């Protein structure tokens, strides 16, 4: 009943030849509720994302 992916013989990573994980990322533009844009490095392929529900419109983060 245990559903698994039965492993292959893994690859031997020699000592000294281990290369660190540098995942492919993009410099994404994040637009908040208001006009404030903020840059973040993200792994998903998209240049721009505007947001509807954010901290800037939520009453908990701002009593104005």
């Amino acid at each position: 009943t245990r559903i698994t992916l039965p492993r292959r013989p893994a690859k031997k990573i020699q000592l000294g030849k281990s290369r660190p994980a540098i995942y492919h990322q993009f410099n994404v533009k994040m637009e908040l509720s208001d006009g404030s844009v903020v840059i973040r490095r993200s792994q998903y392929p998209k240049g721009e994302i505007r947001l509807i529900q954010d901290q800037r419109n939520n009453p908990l983060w701002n009593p104005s």
Partner: protein, 209 residues
């Protein structure tokens, strides 16, 4: 001695600070390095192998020059794997609306308003008052910080927050603004010109960058 309750009301910067040139260059270099060393973009996961979006994505991209037996490749033979030349850096092109950022220079445009908060956005500002001229001095039943807060609240009608009851310096309180003889706002460098040297020396370490 008489107890004069100082206040250095500060405006906290609202955007990431403007970099140095050298720093910027370094950052660019680092980015380039990262790009060179980055893994391949695994398009096969994000985009499906018979989708319209996927097709569109493909259309933007240009492939790598593969190898064919009989030709000279004087820049090394193309070591291509998973749709990328391993040799070199690899890049990827990309209501619905293009996100255009707001300009980081309204103060510059103004070129005048020293009594304005929307001035140097990426710099820490400090309130300063005229009489030499200096920080809002205010002259014993109440706690000190609270008293200071009360005193300045009356002059406008603004919204501040005291960081703590603990004072600094000669008794000066710190506080942070959140709402809107001279009401003057300045950066840490600008203040040096607008004030006596001795005074500056006394309170130089307070005024942050």
């Amino acid at each position: 001695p008489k107890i004069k309750v100082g206040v250095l009301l500060s405006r906290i910067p609202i955007i990431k600070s403007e970099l140095n040139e050298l720093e910027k260059k370094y950052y660019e270099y680092q980015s380039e390095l990262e790009k060179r060393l980055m893994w391949t973009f695994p398009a096969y996961f994000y985009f499906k192998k018979g989708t319209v979006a996927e097709h569109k994505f493909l259309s933007l991209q240009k492939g790598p020059i593969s190898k064919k037996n009989g030709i000279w490749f004087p820049r090394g033979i193309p070591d291509i794997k998973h749709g990328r030349e391993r040799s070199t850096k690899q890049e990827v092109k990309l209501v619905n609306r293009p996100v255009i950022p707001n300009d980081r220079i309204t103060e510059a445009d103004r070129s005048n308003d020293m009594k304005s908060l929307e001035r140097q956005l990426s710099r820490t500002l400090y309130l300063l008052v005229k009489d030499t001229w200096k920080f809002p001095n205010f002259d014993e039943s109440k706690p000190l910080h609270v008293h200071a807060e009360n005193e300045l609240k009356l002059l406008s009608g603004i919204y501040t927050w005291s960081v703590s009851a603990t004072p600094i310096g000669v008794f000066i309180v710190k506080s942070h603004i959140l709402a809107g003889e001279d009401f003057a706002w300045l950066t840490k460098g600008e203040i040096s010109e607008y004030v006596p040297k001795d005074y500056f020396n006394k309170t130089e370490f307070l005024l942050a960058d």
